[PDB]
Structure 1
Amino acid sequence: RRNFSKQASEILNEYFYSHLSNPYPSEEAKEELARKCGITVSQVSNWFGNKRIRYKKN
């Protein structure tokens, strides 16, 4: 398992911090970032799931 490309982590962070009042990317905006970042929509889901909870925990 790898730790993501920086550009991919560039994108994910960008998104999350932008829409912070509702950090829940529409089901289609998931393929957008999954395409942008190169990862899977699944990995995007994991990311926001992880980011979201670890975010309140810090």
Structure 2
Amino acid sequence: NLPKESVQILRDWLYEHRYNAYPSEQEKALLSQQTHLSTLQVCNWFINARRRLLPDMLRK
């Protein structure tokens, strides 16, 4: 599993950008740096999160 603390960061960036859920190449580094997860894990989390967490957020 992923750290509980990193996911809330990713969750937060995602909500803050729910209608443009696409971090630039560099933001992926910034969030990777901010979450201490590899850019592979962050690219992945976004691939996963856009499917699984985002709809419930856009459902507002």
> TM bucket by the smaller chain?
0.7 to 0.9
TM-score if structure 1 supplies the norm length?
Answer: 0.84
**Cα deviations across residues 30-54 of structure 1 (Å, max 9, x unaligned)?**
0111111100111111001001012
Match of 1:50 among 45, 48, 55: 48
The answer to which structure, 1 or 2, has the higher relative contact order (CA under 8 A, 6+ apart) is 2
Once the two structures are TM-superposed, the CA of residue 13 in structure 1 deviates from its matched residue by 0.4
Which has the larger share of helix? 2
Match of 1:20 among 13, 18, 39: 18
Which stretches in structure 1 are left out of the alignment for 5+ residues?
none
TM-score if structure 2 supplies the norm length?
Answer: 0.81
